[PDB]
Swiss-Prot record, chain B:
Organism ancestry: Viruses, Riboviria, Orthornavirae, Pisuviricota, Pisoniviricetes
Residues shown, of full length: 542 to 590 of 1273
Organism: Severe acute respiratory syndrome coronavirus 2
Function: Attaches the virion to the cell membrane by interacting with host receptor, initiating the infection. The major receptor is host ACE2. When S2/S2' has been cleaved, binding to the receptor triggers direct fusion at the cell membrane. When S2/S2' has not been cleaved, binding to the receptor results in internalization of the virus by endocytosis using host TFRC and GRM2 and leading to fusion of the virion membrane with the host endosomal membrane. Alternatively, may use NRP1/NRP2 and integrin as entry receptors.
Subunit record text: Binds to host ACE2. RBD also interacts with the N-linked glycan on 'Asn-90' of ACE2. Cleavage of S generates a polybasic C-terminal sequence on S1 that binds to host Neuropilin-1 (NRP1) and Neuropilin-2 (NRP2) receptors. Interacts with host integrin alpha-5/beta-1 (ITGA5:ITGB1) and with ACE2 in complex with integrin alpha-5/beta-1 (ITGA5:ITGB1). May interact via cytoplasmic c-terminus with M protein. May interact (via N-terminus) with host bilirubin and biliverdin, thereby preventing antibody binding to the SARS-CoV-2 spike NTD via an allosteric mechanism.
Protein name from the UniProt record: Spike protein S1
Phenotype for A29D: In strain: Alpha/B.1.1.7
Amino acid sequence: IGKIQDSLSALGKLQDVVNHNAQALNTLVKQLSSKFGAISSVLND
Amino acid sequence: NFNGLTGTGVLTESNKKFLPFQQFGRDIADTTDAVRDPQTLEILDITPC
């Protein structure tokens, strides 16, 4: 059992969950700077 | 409105240092988060309300 710490000091399956949500939130925000063929991308301008 | 920059938020004293030609700053994802007052030349953060 003592050897277990040496193998740690693996958890990529846990980091992938964090990465997948961070990437969807970074993409969702970036998609606001798109004109989609309009004159501008800002509803006040 | 800072000479064209239109927005809403709370203005507070900042601790950033612009280069001596830059008016305003943006954060990651390209949204304005700091401006410089044209008259007093001080950097102010813009936080959402």
